[PDB]
Amino acid sequence: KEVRKVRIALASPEKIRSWSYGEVEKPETINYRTLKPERDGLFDERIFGPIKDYECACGKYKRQRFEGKVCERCGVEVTKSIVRRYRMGHIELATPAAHIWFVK
Amino acid sequence: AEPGIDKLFGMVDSKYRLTVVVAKRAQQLLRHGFKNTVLEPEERPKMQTLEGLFDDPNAVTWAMKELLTGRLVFGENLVPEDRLQKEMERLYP
Amino acid sequence: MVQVDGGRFATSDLNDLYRRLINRNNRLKKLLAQGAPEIIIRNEKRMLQEAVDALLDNGRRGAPVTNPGSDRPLRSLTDILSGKQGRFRQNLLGKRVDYSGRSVIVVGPQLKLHQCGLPKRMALELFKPFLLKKMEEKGIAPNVKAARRMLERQRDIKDEVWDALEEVIHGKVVLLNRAPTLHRLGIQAFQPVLVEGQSIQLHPLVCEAFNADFDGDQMAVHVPLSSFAQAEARIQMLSAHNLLSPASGEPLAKPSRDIILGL
Amino acid sequence: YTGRGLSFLDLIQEGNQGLIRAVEKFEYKRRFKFSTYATWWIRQAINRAIADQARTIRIPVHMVETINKLSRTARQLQQELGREPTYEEIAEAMGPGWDAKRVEETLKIAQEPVSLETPIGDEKDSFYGDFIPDEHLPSPVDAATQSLLSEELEKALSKLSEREAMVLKLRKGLIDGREHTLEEVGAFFGVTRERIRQIENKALRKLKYHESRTRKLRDFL
Amino acid sequence: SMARPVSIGEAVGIVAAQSIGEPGTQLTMRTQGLPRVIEL
Amino acid sequence: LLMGVTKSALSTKSWLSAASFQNTTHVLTEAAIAGKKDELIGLKENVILGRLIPAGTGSDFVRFTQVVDQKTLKAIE
Amino acid sequence: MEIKRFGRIREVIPLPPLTEIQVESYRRALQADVPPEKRENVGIQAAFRETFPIEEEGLVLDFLEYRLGEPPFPQDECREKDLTYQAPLYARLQLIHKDTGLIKEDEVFLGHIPLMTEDGSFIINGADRVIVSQIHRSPGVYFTPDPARPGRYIASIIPLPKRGPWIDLEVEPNGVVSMKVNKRKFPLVLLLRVLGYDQETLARELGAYGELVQGLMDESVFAMRPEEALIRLFTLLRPGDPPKRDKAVAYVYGLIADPRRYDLGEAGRYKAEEKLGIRLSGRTLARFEDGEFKDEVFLPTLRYLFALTAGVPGHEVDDIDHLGNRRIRTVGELMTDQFRVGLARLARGVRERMLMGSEDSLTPAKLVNSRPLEAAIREFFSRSQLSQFKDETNPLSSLRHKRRISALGPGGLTRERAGFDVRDVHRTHYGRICPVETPEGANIGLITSLAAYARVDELGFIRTPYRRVVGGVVTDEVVYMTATEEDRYTIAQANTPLEGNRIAAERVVARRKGEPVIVSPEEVEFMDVSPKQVFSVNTNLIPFLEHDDANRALMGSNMQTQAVPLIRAQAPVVMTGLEERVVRDSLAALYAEEDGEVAKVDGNRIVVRYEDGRLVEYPLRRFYRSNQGTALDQRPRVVVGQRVRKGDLLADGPASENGFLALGQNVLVAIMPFDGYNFEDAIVISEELLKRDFYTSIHIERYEIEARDTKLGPERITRDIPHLSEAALRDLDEEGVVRIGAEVKPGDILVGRTSFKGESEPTPEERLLRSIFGEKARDVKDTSLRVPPGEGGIVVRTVRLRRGDPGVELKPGVREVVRVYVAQKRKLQVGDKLANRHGNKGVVAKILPVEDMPHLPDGTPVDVILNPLGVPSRMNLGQILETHLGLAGYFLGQRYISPIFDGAKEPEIKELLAQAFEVYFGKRKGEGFGVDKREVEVLRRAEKLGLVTPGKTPEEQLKELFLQGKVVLYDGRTGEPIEGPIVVGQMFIMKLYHMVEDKMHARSTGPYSLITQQPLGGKAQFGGQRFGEMEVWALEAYGAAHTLQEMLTLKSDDIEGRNAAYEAIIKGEDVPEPSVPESFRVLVKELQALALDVQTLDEKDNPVDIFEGLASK
Amino acid sequence: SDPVRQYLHEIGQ
DNA sequence: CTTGACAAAAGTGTTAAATTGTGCTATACTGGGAGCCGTCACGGATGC
DNA sequence: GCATCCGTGAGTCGAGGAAGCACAATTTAACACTTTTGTCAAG
Ligand SMILES: [Mg+2]
Ligand SMILES: [Zn+2]
C-alpha cells in the first residue's frame, strides 16, 4: 500500500533479535591477504548477504536460477547484493547495558 | 510571459489547478502521439527548423494552446480513470 | 570498508566502535567463565557499558573516544543523525541533484524578461539524454550508444548536433538559482537561449530579486524533466509571471539603476 | 604499553587475564617470588592482545612480529646511514630469504585503513567519504544499455525459428540465467548432443547473416 | 504576488517565513534592530 | 499560553519535522517512548520521505482534477 | 616615457626587508652558521638545553652540541621528486655512568629539519608552503576589572601557550583571596603558606592598603607547617590520590615551579618585571631550591592587586587588546615549540628505555629514538593550520602571504568564538597592523597584515619607527618602539610642514595615547617617518588612497593579490613608489651581484663577467607552473657586452616590467553607460585589446597517473589500449604517453593505461553478442588518462618517475608515476573578471569591434567603458583622479609617482592637463583642422549644464572641459557625438585569477556517493549542484510539488527512479513516477541501529515494507 | 567520571 | 534422427608446504598522564 | 530564589581529495587421475 504514517517506538530484545540475520561474534572485518570478509565478523556474508549478485562465498552457485537458496557449503544466501544495505546483525551482550539516550 | 496566461489564470479557481490540467493534458497528447488534439491543422503549434516548419514537439505548449480554445472539459469526478483511458485508447489507437 | 583507486582501504568510524564493543563483550565472557574476582568483573562490565555509550552517542558522557594516533572523536550513531552535517539537514532536507550546472553570470540586455542565455556546452551536458534521443531520431547517429560515443570526444562532435540541441530545448525552461536563496524569487524559470561562450546571460530586470551583481557572481542551472515539472516551472515559476513581491505586493521587477537614469 | 593501539584500561584487563594464568601455573616450591613469574604472563597477555586487537584489519601474530622486526631494522639503518634506507638495504639487513620485493609487500600489508570521516581543510564541512564514488551499483547509463541490448537481441532472435531461438537462449543462459549444456538441453527436447551443436551453429550463422545485412547490433559490442 | 485572492493550496507559511527573514540582513545590529525582532 | 518560535516548533505533533530541526536526541527519545505516530501533515515530513508535499499542485483541492475533450466525453457517455 | 614624481615628505629611512619577519626569525631558531660554542640559548638550542640532561635517577644523558648538514637534494629536485627540502640534524650526546664515572660520546642522527628558501618559504613534499605568524595574548601578569562586581579587579597570570595553567587571583566578597587553577578554586592563603610566608611578612608587606590584608590573615593555617600545608593543598587540587609528601611536592613543583612544565617565557618574564616592578630570576611562578619552595611572583601580584583595589595613583588596569599586551609568534618560534614537544617525547622514550635492557652496555645511539622528533616536526609543517599552501599567483601574492598575521591556529581564537573586540582596529594598530587589509566575511579582523615599516622584535612585540624631535627640530634619529613605549610621548604627523628641519607650523596635529590633539612645536617629542608606515604593502600600492573609502580600499588591496601575470604586462601609469621594491624583495627578478659585463644572453641563462673576474651563470626559470597554475618565467633584459652596475636588473620576473611590478595593462577608459552592457558592475571592452594580446595569460595544468601492482596483475602504461582506433592513439608515442607539443582537447588521451579486469562472468546478452561476432573478451580494460571536460591545450612537459630511481620514494605497490603538463594561452573573454586598484571590479559582459566603440575626435577608440553608477555609492574617488592623471599622461607620454597621502593634488593635475591639451589640440590646429560641427553642438549643451563659461571661443571652452578631464566623444555606431562631454582617461586594470573557464560546469549523470547514493559534489569529481534547504523552501513557496519531488528522488537518490528516468528519456518517453529515496532508507536503518522501531504504516495502520521484501526474514 | 581513577582507587583497597 | 572415437575441461583424491593459531619464558619489579586556553546566549536542573 | 552548572545553538553556495621460539592445527598450492563436455567425422 501507500505510506501514510510513520511510527517510532522502543525495540525489545526480542524484536532486535528478529531483525538480525545472525549474531556478530568476532571483531574481524576482512582478511588482510585475500581481502575477503571474515566469518562471524562485521562484514560476514552468511549474515548480511552476498557481496555480488547471486553468488555465494564458496562460488558454487553463480546464477539467478538458484534464487532464495542457501549454499550448504558456505551458508551464504544466493540473492541480490543490495540486501547488504538492509540486513542487520546483532551482538548478544554478556550483561545488560543501558541506552544512553534514556539516561543522560 | 506565456501567451494568454492572463486568460488561463482566470479560467480556474486556483492557479495550481491550471498546472494540473495542463500537465495532465500534456501527458495525454504525448501518450497518443498528438493524435487526440483538439487543434485544427491551421492552429497546431509549429517550430522553425532548417528543413522547414514542423509540428512543435513540446506537449506543454500544445496543452496551453488547446485549453485557450475552450474545447477541453476539466473538473473533478468527470469520468472514471480506467474508463477514460480505455475509451481514449479505442478512439486514438 | 571500501578500497580506493590507489589500493588503500577507507572505513567508517562505526566499525571501530563496533569492534571495541565486541572485544570487550568477548573478554567479559572469558573472565566470567574463569571465575575472575569481582573487581576484575566490575571493571570489565563498566568498560562494556562505556563501549555501548560511545557507539550510541560518543562524547555525551566522559572523554570522547578517539582513534589511536589522532585526537579526532569517532563519529557515533547520534552524531550521524544530528547537527548541520547530520543525515537530516545534509541528505534529507537537501540533496545534490543530477541535470544541474553552474557558471559565471553576465548581463544580457537583449534578452526578454522570460529568457536567459545558456551556454551551448552547458546545454549539451544538461540535456544529454534528450539530445541522444534526438540524434538517434535524425541520421546523426544509428543508436543512442553510438550517439553517446560521439559526444565523448570534443573533436568528434559534428555541426548537426547543435541543430538537434536547438530542437531539444524548444519550449522547455530551466531554473536559475543564486545562493543564498533568501526568498522564493531566488529561484526563477527562464526559457534558455543557446549562446556562444561559457557565462550565463541574466536579464537586468531580475537582478534585484536574485540580489545579483556582475562582479563575479555564479548561478546554478536546473532542468525539470517531466511534463509536470515543466508545467509548474512554465506557469508558476516563470520570471515573467512573478512581477510583484510576495512580501509587500509592490513591483519587484521594475526599472533599475541605468534604466531609471536614462528615463 | 600505552600508545600501541589499545587504551590503558584495555591493556589492564588483558594483563589481568595473564595474571589469572600466572596464578594457575605458579609453583611456590621453587622459592621464587610471585612477581618474578607473573611478569612473564602479564607481558605475554598484553603483547598478544595488541597483536590481535590493534588493527581494524586483523594481521596474524607471526606477520605482526615480521612487521615489528622490519620496522626496527629500518630504524637502525636510518640512524646509521643518516637517511631513510631503501628496500635493498632493509632486505639485506633482515637476512636470508629477504629481498626488496618482500619488503615492499610487507610494508604494503602493514598499511592501516584511513577513516571515511577525516576532515579536509580548515572548514569542517568536507570529508573523505564525499570524494569516493560508489562503483558497485550500475549507473543509469549502464542500466539503460543493458536493457537496450536485451531489447535488440530479442528482436534479432525473432527471425530465428521457434526451436532454434530456444536452443540459443538455453545454451547462453537467457532463460534460466545459467548456461545449459548439449546434453541437458538434449534431455529437454529428447535429442542427442551432436544435433544441438549443429543447429546452434546453423542458427548462429543465420544471426551473423542478419546482423551483416542490417548492422543494428555492432554498437553494443 | 498577483493582486488577487489567494489560491487554495498555497504554502503561505513558507512565504511568511521567507518574507520576514529576507530583509533581516538590512536590519541594524550595531533592544533595537535584528536583536529586537529575535527577542520578540 | 505564549511561547517562542523555537519552543513552539519543538513541541509540534510530528516527530519527523521536530527531529530534523533541533534537539534530535531529545525529540526522538520522547517520541520513541510515547510511540508517537507521524501523520505527515506539513511540508518537512513529506520532503523527508520524498513524497508529494500537500501544497501547490500536490494539494488535495486540485490534485485530482481530470481533463478530457468533448469527443471522448461523449464516447464515455 | 619619463617619470614625474610628486610629494613633499622626505623619507629618512627606506623600507625594511619585506620578508625579514620570516627570514630573520628562522635564522635565529636554527643558528646553523654561528659556531656551536657561541650559540645563544634561543631556538632549538634552548630546547636542547631544556630537555637535557636526561637523568634516570645513575645514568645521565647530556647534550653537548648539535649541527646541521647540507641538504640531500637541491630545491628544484625536491619539487620535481615530491621531496622536502631539509637538512640532516646531528646531536653530540654523552652517556655518563654516575656509578663508575665513565663518559661515552658519539654523534646521533636526530632526523631532518626543513630548510627555508631565500624568499622565506618551505618546500614540503615538493610543494611551496608559508608558515603564517600567529598573534595571541602576551604572557605575563594582567589586572582586569571584574564585570559582575564593580570596584573589584582580578589578577591573571598567563604562561606561554601549552606551558602551564592560567592562574586567577580574585578577592571574594567574603574578603578571602581565592586562587583558581584548572577550574578549581582554593584560598590563596594556603598556597602562600606553602611558600614559607608567615603572618608578620604579609602584614609588613601587604598591610599598608586596608582591610584587604586582614582578609589574608587566617591563622587556622599560619601555625600549620609548610609541609602539612603542602599536603593540604595537594588534596584540594587533586582529591582521591593517596596523600604522600613525595607525591605532593612532585605535583606542586610540576604545577608552578618546574621549568620543563611551566614556562612564563622571555616575553612573559619581561612583562612581569616591567609591570610589578620586580626582577624574576627565571621564568616560573616559584623556585624549588634547598628542599623548599620560594616565591617569585605571587606576592608582587597580590601586592599590585591589593594596591589597585585600594586606589593608589601608580596602578592601572590592563587592556588585553592593547598591542603591547599582544605578541607575534613567528615561524622560528612556532617551529621551536613543536621541536621542544618532539624532544620531550624523545626524552620520555630515553627514560623508559634506559631503565630496562643491558644497562651496563648502553650507548647514546641505542637510547635515542628520533622517530617522535621527526613525527612532531613533519606534523607541524604538513598538518598545521598555520602551515599553508603558498599563494603565488604573482610575486605580490607570495610577498603578502609571508606578512600575514593570523589570530587563528593551534593555540589561538576560533572563527565562530571570536567577538567584536578581537576583530576591531585598536588604536595601537597605528603603524604596526594595516587598518584596511583584512578578509571580508567571517574572517574579518582575524587575519591581518604587517604594516610596511613595522618589525617584530625579539620578544614578539611589533615596533614602528619614529623620528626624534628635540627643541622643535626634527632629527634623523629614528627610534623603533612598541605600543606601550609609544603611549608616553606626543607624536606629531608626517605631513607637518618643516622649514628645513625646524617645524614651521605653529599648530601641530599629534597623537597622545592614540587621541588626536593639537600641540605647539615645543611639545612635540617624536614624528612619523612617513604616511606609508600606517598601511601594508598591498595598500601602499593604491594611488590616491586618501580619496577612497576604506571598505573599497580593502577590496583593492586584496584583489591585487589575485591578478595573473600577463605576457604583455606593463607597469601602471600612476604609481606610488613601491613598485620597484616589491619586485626586488620578492626575489622573482634577477639582479647583478656587482659591477660587471654581460658575456652571454639567452632565453635559458645569463652569464656575467664580473669586475673581480669570476664567471657567474644564472639559469632562468622558464614556463614554471606555480601553485595556482599560472606560468612563472623570467625574461632576459640585457644584451651581450652590456655593462651592468651592482644591483642592475638582468631579467624581469613574472608580472614585472623593467623591474616595476606589472599586474595588468594600461588602457584607455571612458566612464559612461553603454546600452546596458555596463549594468551592475559589468564591463565593456574592445576587440582591439584581444588583437594586440592584452590581458593574455599563460596557465599550465598538471595531470598525474600511476601504474600500480594489483592482485590480478600489474597495470601497464602502454600505447596498446584495447578497442581503440588509430585516431584516438595518433598523439601517443610508443611508450603510451602523449607526445610533447601535441594539442589536446577534452576526451583526448594523455597517458594510455590498461588494467586487468576483475574476474567476473559476463551477462548472457553480452555473451551472446560475443558469440555472434566471434570476438574473444580480453583480460585488460581501458583505464587511461584523458583530458577532462573544459580543459586542454598544448603538452609542454612529461615527467616519468619509476621505482628505484634516486630520490623517488614511491608508495608501496606503485610501479611508476607519469606527470603531464598542459599549457594554454588564455585571452580575455566574456565572464573574465577585471579590477583596478581602487576596489572597482567586474566581469567582461561584451566585447565590441573597434568600429563600435566610442572614439576621440582624432579617431582613437577607447578600450574599456566603465559605468559611472559604480562610483557614488562606493565613494572611491581615487579611480577618477587616476583617470584624470592618466589622460594627461597619455598625451604627454609620461608616467607619474604620487605617494599615498603626499602626492598629486588637483591643481598639479590641472596644470598637467593644460599641457596635455596643448599637444592634443595644438596638433589638430597645425594639421589644418578647426572645430568640428559635432563639437560645437556638445559645447552648446555643456554651457547649459554649467560646465563651461558662456561667451568664450570653442577652443577656450574645449580647454575648460579638458581641465575637468572631459572630452567630446563620438559614437562609433551613429557617428554623432555623445550629448555630454565624457571623462576619458588612461587607467590601470588587472585581470583577476577568477576566470569563467575554470568555473563553468554541468552534469546530467555521473558518480554517486557510497552510503547515501546521492551525486558527488565539485567540478573536479563531475558532481551535481547542492539543492539545500533554502532551495527546497523556494519550491515549496512556489507550490511546485512535482518539481520538488523530482529533485528529491528522480535526480538525487531514487536508484530505481533515476535508472528508469534516464531510460525513459532516451526512448522518447515521459519519466515515470518516482519512489522512496534511498536516504530515507538509510534513515530507517540508522534509527534501527539505535534500537528504535521505526515503521511506515498505511491508511489502515498496517505495516508497509519499503525494502521490497529484501530485509524481512 | 574517570574510569582509570575509579579502577586505581578500587585496587588500592 | 544417431554412433562411436577422441580432445580438452571441470571434478575429485591425496600430498606437502605454507600459513596461522596457541602455549610458554621462574632474580625482583605492585596506583596514569595529559590535560594547561579569549563567547554568549538561552532553557532547564536539582540543589539549597 | 538564586547562583551555578549542564546542554544546545549560532547563514548559503563554491573550492580544497617497541620479543622470540617451538609445536600443533589449519588452509592452500600442485599434481595425478577420472568424468564430462565439446567437436569431429561417420552416417
Ligand atoms: Mg557580487
Ligand atoms: Zn556457496
DSSP letters of G700-756?
EEEEEEEEEEETTEE-EE-S--TT--TTTTSSB-TTSBBPTT-EE-TT-EEE-EEEE
Cell of B52: 522547414
- Angle of CA points C104, C105, C110, to nearest 5°: 145
> In Å, what resolution does this model reach?
2.6
Q: What does DSSP assign to residue G978? A: P
Other CB atoms within a 10 A radius of the CB of residue G685 amount to 27
Yes or no: say if C215 and G843 are a contact pair by the CB < 8 Å rule.
yes
Q: Which residue is nearest to nucleotide I29 (CA to C1')?
A: D35
Contacts of E10 in chain F (CB under 8 A): 55-56
The C-alpha atoms of residue C87 and residue G1082 are separated, in whole angstroms, by 9
Quick one: cell of C153? 570526444
CA–CA separation, G585 and G590 (whole Å)? 11
Partners of D131 on chain G (C-beta within 8 Å) are: 1016, 1018, 1021
Write the class of the CATH domain C96-118+172-241: mainly beta
Please give the angle made by the CA atoms of G860, G861 and G867, to the nearest 5 degrees.
140
Q: Which residues pair with C220 in a beta bridge?
A: C102, C177
Which of C133, C203, C234, C244 best tests the B interface by mutation, with the highest count of B CBs <10 A? C234
Q: What is the 3-state secondary structure (H, E, C) of G329-340?
A: ECHHHHHHHHHH
State which amino acid sits at residue G34. Answer: V
Which helix or strand (DSSP H or E) is residue G29 part of?
Answer: helix G20-30
> What are the cell numbers at G569?
604586462
- With CA atoms as reference, the chain E residue closest to C182 would be E22
Contact in structure between G455 and G462 (CB atoms under 8 Å)? yes
Angstrom distance (rounded) from CA D200 to CA D193: 11
CA of C180 to the centre of ligand 1 (A): 12
Region of residue G909 (phi > 0: left; psi between -120 and 50: alpha; otherwise: beta)? alpha
The answer to whether G582 and G671 have CB atoms below 8 angstroms apart is no
Chains D and E touch (3+ CB pairs under 8 A): no
- C238 near C189, Cβ under 8 Å? yes
Q: Could you say which ligand is closest to the alpha carbon of residue A56?
A: 2
Whether residues E8 and B15 touch (CB distance < 8 A) is answered with no
Distance from CA of B79 to the nearest CA of G (A): 22
Q: Residue D63 CA to nucleotide I20 C1', Å?
A: 10
Convert G195-242 into a string of H (helix), E (strand) and C (coil). CCCCHHHHHHHHCCCCHHHHCCCCHHHHCCCHHHHHHHHHHHHCCCCC
Contact F20 C92 (CB under 8 A): yes
Chain G CB contacts of D80 below 8 Å = 109
User: E strand or H helix at D16, and its extent?
Assistant: helix D8-25
Do β-strands G649-652 and G660-661 pair in parallel, antiparallel, or remain unpaired?
unpaired
- Mutating which of C44, C46, C48, C53 best tests the H interface, going by the most H Cβ atoms within 10 A? C46
Residue C216 · residue C222 · CB < 8 Å: no
Task: State how far the Cα of G395 lies from the Cα of G168, in Å rounded to an integer.
Answer: 47
Could you tell me which of G103, G153, G490 has the C-alpha nearest to residue G305? G153
Tell me the β-bridge partners of A77.
A70
Q: In 3D, which of C223, C142, C239 has the Cα closest to residue C186?
A: C239
Beta strands in G881-950 (DSSP E): 895-897
- Residue B13 touches chain E, beta carbons under 8 Å: yes
CB B26 within 8 A of CB C231: yes
Helical H segments across chain B, by residue range: 5-10, 15-31, 59-69, 81-91
Classified by CATH at the fold level, domain F64-77 comes out as 6.10.250
CA-to-CA distance for G514 and C136, rounded, in angstroms? 77
> Position of cell 555630454?
G980
Task: Give me the count of residues in chain D.
Answer: 221
Question: Measured in angstroms, how far is the CA atom of residue C217 from the centroid of ligand 1?
Answer: 5
Q: Which ligand neighbours the alpha carbon of A66 most closely? A: 2
Can you name the residues that pair with G388 across neighbouring β-strands? G130
Q: What angle do CA G237, G238, G242 make, to 5 degrees?
A: 130
Taking a C-beta distance cutoff of 8 angstroms, is the pair D87, D108 a contact?
Answer: no
Q: What are phi and psi of C166, to 5 degrees?
A: -60, -40
Please tell me whether residue C142 adopts helix, strand or coil conformation: coil
Distance CA(D77)–CA(D86), nearest Å, equals 10
Say whether the D–G interface has 3 or more Cβ pairs within 8 Å: yes
- Smallest CA–CA separation between H2 and chain D, in Å? 11
| For helices G298-310 and G199-206, angle between their N-to-C axes, nearest 10 degrees | 50
| G14 burial via Cβ count (<10 Å: 0-12, 13-18, 19+) | exposed
Are G964 and G984 in contact by the 8 Å Cβ rule? The answer is: no
Show the domains of chain B with their CATH numbers: 1-93 (3.90.940.10)
Q: Are B61 and C171 in contact (CB under 8 A)?
A: yes
C227 closest CB neighbour out of B18, B47, B60: B60
Q: How deeply is F1 buried, as exposed, middle or buried, from its count of CB atoms within 10 A (0-12, 13-18, 19+)?
A: exposed
Q: Is the peptide bond before C37 cis (omega within 30 degrees of 0)?
A: no
Distance CA G866, CA G680 (A): 10
Distance in angstroms between the alpha carbons of the first and the last residue of chain E: 27
Q: Distance between CA atoms of G677 and C111, rounded to whole angstroms?
A: 12
Amino acid at D135: E
Please count the other Cβ atoms lying within 10 Å of the Cβ belonging to residue G671: 24
Instruction: Check CB contact under 8 Å for G1036 and E14.
Output: yes
Taking CA–CA distances from F24, the nearest residue in chain G reads G1087
Alpha-carbon distance of G249 to G258, in angstroms, equals 11
Stretch 75-104 of chain A: residues touching chain F, C-beta under 8 Å: 101-102
Q: What are phi and psi of D52, to 5 degrees?
A: -105, -25
End-to-end CA gap in chain G: 88
Confirm if C48 and C24 have CB atoms less than 8 A apart: yes
Q: Which residues of F touch A103 (CB under 8 A)?
A: none
Q: Three-class SS string for G239-287?
A: CCCCCCHHHHHHHHHHHHHCCCCCCCCHHHHHHHHHHHCCCCCCCCCEE
Please answer yes or no on whether A10 and F25 come within 8 Å at the CB atom.
no
Contacts of F37 in chain G (CB under 8 A): 1097
| Distance of alpha carbon H3 from alpha carbon B73, whole angstroms | 76
- Interface with F, mutate which of B11, B15, B16, B90 (most F CBs under 10 A): B16
* D91 marked as binding residue: yes
Give the distance, in angstroms, between residue D44 CA and nucleotide I23 C1'. Answer: 10
Measured between alpha carbons, how far is G900 from A101 in angstroms, rounded to an integer?
64
Give the Cβ contact number of residue A61 at 10 Å.
Answer: 22
Omega within 30 of 0 (cis) for the link into G159: no
DSSP string, G485-509: HHTTSEEE-TT--EETTEE--SSEE
Among G1036, G1076, G1092, beta carbon nearest to F50: G1076
For B82, residues 6+ apart whose C-beta sits below 8 A from its C-beta are none
Q: Name the grid cell of G777.
A: 573478451
> In chain B, how many H helices and how many E strands?
4, 3
Give CA–CA dist A57/A80, Å, rounded: 13
With beta carbons less than 8 A apart as the criterion, state whether C234 and C189 touch: yes
Q: How far apart are the first and last CA of chain A?
A: 39
> Cβ of G1033 and E17 within 8 Å?
yes
Q: How far is the CA of E40 from the C1' of I18 (A)?
A: 77
**Residue F11 cell numbers, joined:** 513541541
Q: What nucleotides of chain I have any atom within 7 angstroms of a protein Cβ?
A: 1-4, 19-40, 42-44
G622: CB partners within 8 A, 6+ apart: G603, G604, G633, G634
Q: How far apart are CA F69 and CA B70, in angstroms?
A: 9
How far apart (Å, rounded) are the C-alpha atoms in residues G1077 and C96? Answer: 13
Asked if G257 and G238 touch (Cβ cutoff 8 Å), the reply is: no
User: What SS3 class is residue G74?
Assistant: coil
Q: What distance in Å separates the CA atoms of residue A59 and residue F5, rounded to the nearest whole number?
A: 60
Q: Which chains have 3 or more CB–CB distances shorter than 8 Å to chain E?
A: B, C, F, G
- Burial label, A26 (beta-carbon count in 10 A; 0-12, 13-18, 19+): middle
The residue in chain D having the minimum alpha-carbon distance to the alpha carbon of residue G1058 is: D140
Neighbours of chain G (3+ CB pairs under 8 A): A, B, C, D, E, F, H
Q: By CB neighbour count within 10 A (0-12 exposed, 13-18 middle, 19+ buried), where does G226 fall?
A: middle
- C-alpha closest to that of C9 among G596, D112, G937: D112
Nearest amino-acid residue to I25, taking CA and C1': D40
Nearest alpha carbon to residue B29 among B3, B63, B77? B63
Indicate the angle between helix axes D8-25 and C38-56, nearest 10 degrees: 150
Question: G994 near G835, Cβ under 8 Å?
Answer: no
E11 touches chain F (CB under 8 A): yes
Tell me the three state secondary structure of residue E36. helix
Asked if C82 has any chain A CB less than 8 Å from its own CB, the reply is no
What domains sit in chain G, N to C, each tagged with a CATH number?
A: 1-6+663-695+828-992 (2.40.270.10), 16-138+319-464+530-588 (3.90.1100.10), 139-318 (3.90.1110.10), 465-529 (2.30.150.10), 589-653 (2.40.50.100), 696-827 (2.40.50.150)
- CATH assignment, C119-171: 1.10.40.90
Distances G464 to F66, G456, G458, G524 between C-alpha atoms, Å: 81, 9, 14, 17
Distance D167 CA to J40 C1' (A): 21
Chain J bases closer than 7 A to any CB of the protein: 7-22, 28, 36-42
From the candidates B8, B14, B18, which should be mutated to test the interface with E, based on the most E CB atoms within 10 A? B14
Q: Are F60 and F54 in contact (CB under 8 A)?
A: yes
Q: How far is G1099 from chain A (nearest CA, A)?
A: 6
Q: Check if the beta carbon of residue G607 is closer than 8 Å to that of residue G599.
A: yes
What is the spatial distance between Cα G1043 and Cα D22, in angstroms, rounded to a whole number? 71
